[PDB]
Design a protein around this ligand. Structure first.
Ligand code: HEC
Length: 82
């Protein structure tokens, strides 16, 4: 309740997903990509605010209105997804 709920209010669900997918790699598939790199939370923060591409597909992710506070938490729950 201190990590998943945030993903809800966060439009990250509109594009990303938890047990499926639509545009970007579901945090589940992404968690496995940055799993070995548990310290990937810092790299994601730079890929979320300034968007990022080539890491998954030719679809650059538009910058989202997220700060370091929400970007950090959301990054902690995404890494703890599984
Ligand atoms: C559709 C406009 C998206 C919304 C809304 C959010 N994200 Fe996204 N994200 C999107 C795409 C298409 C991609 C893949 C980009 C690529 O080419 O690889 C992503 C990727 C991420 C990642 C991983 C970045 C990487 O591994 O290099 C993260 C950590 C991520 N997105 C986070 C994130 C958050 C927290 C969002 C809500 C603020 C969010 N995304 C929304 C597309 C879209």
């Amino acid at each position: 309740q201190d990590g998943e709920a945030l993903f809800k209010s966060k439009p990250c669900a509109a594009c990303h997903s938890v047990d499926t997918k639509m545009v970007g790699p579901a945090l589940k598939e992404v968690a496995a990509k940055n799993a070995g790199v548990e310290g990937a939370a810092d790299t994601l923060a730079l890929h979320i605010k300034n968007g990022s591409q080539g890491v998954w597909g030719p679809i650059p992710m538009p910058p989202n209105p997220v700060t370091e506070e929400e970007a950090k938490i959301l990054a902690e729950w995404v890494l703890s997804l599984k």
